[PDB]
Design a binder for these strands. Sequence first.
DNA 1: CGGAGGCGCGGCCGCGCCGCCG
DNA 2: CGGCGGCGCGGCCGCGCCTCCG
Lengths: 354, 353
Amino acid sequence: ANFIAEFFGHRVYPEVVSTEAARNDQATGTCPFLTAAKLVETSCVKAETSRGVCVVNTAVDNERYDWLVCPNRALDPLFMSAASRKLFGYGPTEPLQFIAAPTLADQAVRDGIREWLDRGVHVVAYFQEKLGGELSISKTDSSPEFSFDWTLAEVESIYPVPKIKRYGVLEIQTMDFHGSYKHAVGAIDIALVEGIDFHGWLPTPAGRAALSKKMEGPNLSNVFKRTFYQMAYKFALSGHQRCAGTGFAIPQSVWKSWLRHLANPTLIDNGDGTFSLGDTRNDSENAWIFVFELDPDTDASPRPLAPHLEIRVNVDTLIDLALRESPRAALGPSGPVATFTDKVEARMLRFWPK
Amino acid sequence: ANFIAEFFGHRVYPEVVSTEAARNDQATGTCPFLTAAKLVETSCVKAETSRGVCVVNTAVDNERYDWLVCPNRALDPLFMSAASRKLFGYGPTEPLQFIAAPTLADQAVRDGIREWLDRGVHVVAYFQEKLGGELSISKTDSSPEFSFDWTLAEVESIYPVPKIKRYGVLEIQTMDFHGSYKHAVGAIDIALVEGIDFHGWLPTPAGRAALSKKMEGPNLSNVFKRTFYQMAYKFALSGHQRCAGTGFAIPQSVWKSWLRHLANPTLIDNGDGTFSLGDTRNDSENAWIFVFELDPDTDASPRPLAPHLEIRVNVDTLIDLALRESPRAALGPSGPVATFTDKVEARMLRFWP
DNA sequence: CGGAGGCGCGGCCGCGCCGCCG
DNA sequence: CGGCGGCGCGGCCGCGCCTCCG
Ligand SMILES: [Ca+2]
Ligand SMILES: [Ca+2]
Ligand SMILES: [Ca+2]
Ligand SMILES: [Ca+2]
Ligand SMILES: [Fe+3]
Ligand SMILES: [Fe+3]
């Protein structure tokens, strides 16, 4: 029922979408997303028990879902540049240059940036775990330590010393799972090395069994617990003058799983290709949730990220929905808590003999 | 720097408890808390890589702390009964029977409950994962599924069919860690079987180096993330008329780590052996945080849980402190965000030749 | 109704930043 | 002004409940 969906960036379950490059990435063991970003060959960062498992496919409530399972699978600079526009308040057709932070060591691009600042072209450099390293805000007696997945830097000048106008934050959350992939990885790895035709073997019942061997479901409530807190906290930090906006990038599958956690919220249609969660018409701290898909239309080797839903969020609404609205629905007339007393009595009754 | 604090329920780092009972439980691999709760010999439920590591000792901000790392180490029926009195509204000195749900199978205790009920004595049966299994509430379109660590059934009737007046909820939280215990466990496991006099070997430099082998620190923020959500949600659920109250039981160490998460809060002294987090005069959700210690006074082999701090919480204040007050402190003067713009530029300048 | 699978729960794992000590 | 190390972060792990499907 549960399947490894992508193996080193390339589809294996729903379709075995494999070109010549797909054969190579899997044989060498290379995450194509780190390689394309850094322009240097890079193997997946994961331990042997889950090596190359970038996406897992499962059903919840009788519907199929791709679950991103590696933060590096959502390492799509092109998508992040687009989401950046919404954070810094740029138009859709505005000149923008989105470069990595390690590139700043190169003279050729430092001379290039200066020319862009003269033209009025926006220059944003990003700091990411494997591309420059993350940035952190230190703990206090009244505040905990925090780290940002993507720190965006809007450049003002770099003439003598690099200086920024504003900064941006993108937070990525994928999904973690129950159990292990060890058995599914182990079974498909022997068909990779010892086997003579791997891609022709994956769509077969034997390969489909191997891709699913002891594969379990997603840790749904776990990521909501961890991501909700970071949302509420980091969105409040976005209200700082020098912070242009904070956005959380999450897959469609993850967004849908959060709906019950948010008391089944109705999104407001703004008529601007964007949606809103609560009243964002006043005193806004430019808080965003970018719900993305794995592009089902591209045909290109690794499916890139495509926008699915762009939600501007009211923080107090987000807090109120999760911690007040949802419990009240659980305390509803036909809800689970109404019948709980009978459940306790039923569970007690099981210990009675005969 | 970081040490295994106790092995199979008996202290090993700060002081080595060297009783015959401490030697026996270690050599036989029994978690002494499960075997005492259901009166049947039971080994630790943990996997080989962390087997027996029921507590870990670490320093944060230059002071020592014991981190419980096994929910079964907090399995203390004696402590939970005292905490339940606060939940159901019993005085400190009034009759109370606190029994595990599995025992309901016995006809001797079933008749015993009937005898207690008609003499006004309170009877509460508890459901815990290893003792009767946990109770859960199922998901809806507007609410997620939840499980309760301890669900407490205040019995009123047994004769025809078991029936309860109210239910109570106790949630238990300890601590998870970074890295592995594997290397420290494997270093002392070979000392247990292949060597002689295990306790005498533990306090030596070589032993203390073994107890600390690649031992890392507590996963502090992780635990707050997971538990805060359960607090806010389950405390709101406690408002239900059939729910007497819900309490969260945590070690002192983890409560101290929560202070920065709660904008450094100041507890209001009620002058009744109880403190309050916010205004708890009106509308009572009957929500509690029971902060406990590993009893340092009594020198029994496994040191039981002793009350350290008994807190009434205003749920709305708990949410406010963590999600509004704390972020505002971080944005304040001399805060980390104030100097963040310079940090970006400094990190940006590190690429310059 | 009985075995299989979903998933809350909560402890294992290591990367890489930054604070602390010498 | 360098290297141990604390710790945020976020993905691995399996227990035992319950709901679903044959
Ligand atoms: Ca991060
Ligand atoms: Ca995140
Ligand atoms: Ca708990
Ligand atoms: Ca539990
Ligand atoms: Fe990957
Ligand atoms: Fe244990």
